[PDB]
């Protein structure tokens, strides 16, 4: 708020002002990979990749 001095104060009334801040989002973050079905005979690398992605 403003503060004002004196007795008269005539024609010197102020208004109200409240400011704002905006919160937004970003883009999604991804781990994205492709595997052929022959690569899933042993799936250990696939699981370890999931853990690395986390």
């Amino acid at each position: 708020s403003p503060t004002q001095e004196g007795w008269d104060l005539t024609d010197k009334a102020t208004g109200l002002l409240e400011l704002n801040v905006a919160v937004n989002m970003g883009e999604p973050d991804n781990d994205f990979f492709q595997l052929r079905a022959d690569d899933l005979r042993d799936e250990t690398a696939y699981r370890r990749r999931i853990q690395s992605a986390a």
């Binding site: 595997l35 079905a37 022959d38 899933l40 005979r41 799936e43 696939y46």
Partner: protein, 54 residues
Amino acid sequence: QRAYANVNTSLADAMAVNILNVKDARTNVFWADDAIRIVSQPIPANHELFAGMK
């Protein structure tokens, strides 16, 4: 090593190589059975990586 010898003598400095495909003839094949092996493998497309496909 000599226990595995299958030939009387090695290849000399220059002995003629005899070609045995001199005419285009349809082949007759003979073997001792199980000389040919068929190696088969599965395709793990039933893995969770493949979800839209049955």
